[PDB]
Amino acid sequence: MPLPKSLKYGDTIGIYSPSSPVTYTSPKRFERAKSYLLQKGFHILEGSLTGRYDYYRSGSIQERAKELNALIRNPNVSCIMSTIGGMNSNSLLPYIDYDAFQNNPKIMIGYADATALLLGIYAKTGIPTFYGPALVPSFGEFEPFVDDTYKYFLETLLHDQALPYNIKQPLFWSDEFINWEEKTKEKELRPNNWISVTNGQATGRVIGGNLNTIQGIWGSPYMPCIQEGDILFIEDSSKDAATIERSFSFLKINGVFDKVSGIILGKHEQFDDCGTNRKPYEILLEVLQNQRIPLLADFDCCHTHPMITMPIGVQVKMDATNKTIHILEKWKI
Amino acid sequence: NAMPLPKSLKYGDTIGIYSPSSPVTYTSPKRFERAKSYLLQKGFHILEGSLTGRYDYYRSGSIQERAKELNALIRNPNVSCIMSTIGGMNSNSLLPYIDYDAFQNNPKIMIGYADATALLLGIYAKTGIPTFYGPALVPSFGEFEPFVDDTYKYFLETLLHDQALPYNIKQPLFWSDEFINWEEKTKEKELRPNNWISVTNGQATGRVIGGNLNTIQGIWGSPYMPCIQEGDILFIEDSSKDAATIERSFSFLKINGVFDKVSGIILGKHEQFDDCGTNRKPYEILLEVLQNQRIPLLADFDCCHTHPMITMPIGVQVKMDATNKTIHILEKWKI
Ligand SMILES: Nc1ncnc2c1ncn2[C@@H]1O[C@H](COP(=O)(O)O)[C@@H](O)[C@H]1O
Ligand SMILES: Nc1ncnc2c1ncn2[C@@H]1O[C@H](COP(=O)(O)O)[C@@H](O)[C@H]1O
Secondary structure: OOOOOOOOOOOEEEEEOOOOOHHHHOHHHHHHHHHHHHHHOOEEEEOOOOOOOEOOEOOOHHHHHHHHHHHHOOOOEEEEEEOOOOOOHHHHHHHOOHHHHHHOOOEEEEOHHHHHHHHHHHHHHOOOEEEOOOHHHHHOOOOOHHHHHHHHHHHHHOOOOOOOEEOOOOOEEEOOOOOOOOOOOOOOOEEOOOEEEEOOEEEEEEEEEEHHHHOOOOOOOOOOOOOOOOEEEEEOEOOEHHHHHHHHHHHHHOOHHHOOOEEEEEOOEOOEOOOOOOOHHHHHHHHHOOOOOOEEEEEOOOOOEOOOOEEEOOEEEEEOOOOEEEEOOOOOO | OOOOOOOOOOOOOEEEEEOOOOOHHHHOHHHHHHHHHHHHHOOOEEEEOOOOOOOEOOEOOOHHHHHHHHHHHHOOOOEEEEEEOOOOOOHHHHHHHOOHHHHHHOOOEEEEOHHHHHHHHHHHHHHOOOEEEOOOHHHHHOOOOOHHHHHHHHHHHHHOOOOOOOEEOOOOOEEEOOOOOOOOOOOOOOOEEOOOEEEEOOEEEEEEEEEEHHHHOOOOOOOOOOOOOOOOEEEEEOOOOEHHHHHHHHHHHHHOOHHHOOOEEEEEOOOOOEOOOOOOOHHHHHHHHHOOOOOOEEEEEOOOOOEOOOOEEEOOEEEEEOOOOEEEEOOOOOO
């Protein structure tokens, strides 16, 4: 497994907008996010589409691919981070310079729609990528949560890590819908718990990301093939019960649950239960139909705050019963 | 090497109805009753599925209940046609539990659209029997005059009447995607002069495969999605999405190499499309995704959520002429 170099203070983080033009539509949170990382001691290299607006997206398919490729090809950039998600990252996949990435591996990080690029790069190059902070939603967050997200960010990308790296459960979380551009209030601290939905243990390569986004790359050369023993990691956000039942069944009929040895389900930001008062793992439970797969839910790697940074494509040990996650193989130098 | 085809619909036949997703018979009782009465006055009998009237919020019932409802119709010898009441999100849940052996033992006309695409394509993939992208009971036959009469005409001409081949699918003269007159009629829908669009000139002949594109992403890669083969004609439609969503869906097809295989594309109208302020039409977004690849493309085809609705067989040879805006079915889809 070829690995990216650890982040170091003084390094340059290159940012790009593969989908929504957030640097145009949310300039205050964008500037706040840049300033936050600059103060920590990282430089920011703004991609070529920063500040541009093409309505639902930052620019054309070709322009977006060029923005990302310029960062991949830049030897001065140690980390490539999406500004935010959207719907349209998968449009870039045919045009990405995977050979340039494989020849000099970098840290590739982000979440939600950026899953298309995280998984595509992993599928094409075999280099682990990272489900974690996007610049504007994650680092543009006000105190206190941004500081917890940052701690996880350093733990995975910067710290010399004694293995196994036990991913520690944050004490509090929030999916509260406020304080986007300007801080009007204080976010309620939700006491936190991971859920032991189905007891057991699994070890294998972790694969996954945003499930809604995965259905946009499924079956293509850019979706890594799920293998027997893999641990499936999935999260969704701001969907309703109908939508996630379809996504869960999509996995079911593709025979994914006949393959994976365990499941980690993220919290679901602003979930719409359609009046059923059922939680997402419950809907997943119906789809599974009493197939015993260890299942740990409400994992904090998703649209809720704070956010863990998770390596994708490396061996992991999940213990749903004892509610632990350990990274058992090196994801960086 | 010929194939099993469902028997043609005939007057007095029983149409079994089921709700594979949304509980529309509970939430829209006026349009449900009106749709049923429309088909009854035409001389058809209706067999209500076991989940009729029931309400489980976003769905008609549990996964097992819904598979049971549909399988009861499939295993019933007196049902000649199985029609969904309406779509939703959750038809794909049923796929592992459907009795495909029973269906293939006594093939029926399977018809519906939107979310029901999961089942139409699932059954075709498993049994090789053509299925039909066409009316669902409540949205299609619950429609007030005049449009319901056009939808019925195409339904009949395709499923009941004897048809010589090639069979010309005629362009409706008027259409509407107006969001009104659901339960009660408060005004007349605008009769919009209709046109199919020649987006990219040319002709294609091949097996037509497709349906609701959003729903196809829920069965993709599974045993229930028929494999797209070289030469196929891709038929796709979506409804009530925005530009961002359909770019994702078009790129999904692109990165799966679908456009490297198909000989042509038929794109349905897009009911209540949200262009996100771009003023772009769905086919212009598709064309960007296609980049420098040239593919004959006929758009605004009337087999989708707009009214009236054409009934289209899936899995049979078709000729599309995008230049002259014609579609012909070249192969028997029924007996
Ligand atoms: N106006 C807003 N108010 C509150 N939260 C927002 C707003 N716009 C975007 N967000 C959040 O920003 C994040 C963007 O996620 P994604 O767009 O899927 O990459 C989600 O957590 C959204 O809830
Ligand atoms: N309240 C409503 N008013 C008008 N049209 C509706 C309403 N509810 C549903 N419809 C129509 O019914 C269709 C249902 O299709 P689907 O849910 O996609 O299978 C929608 O796309 C609309 O065209």
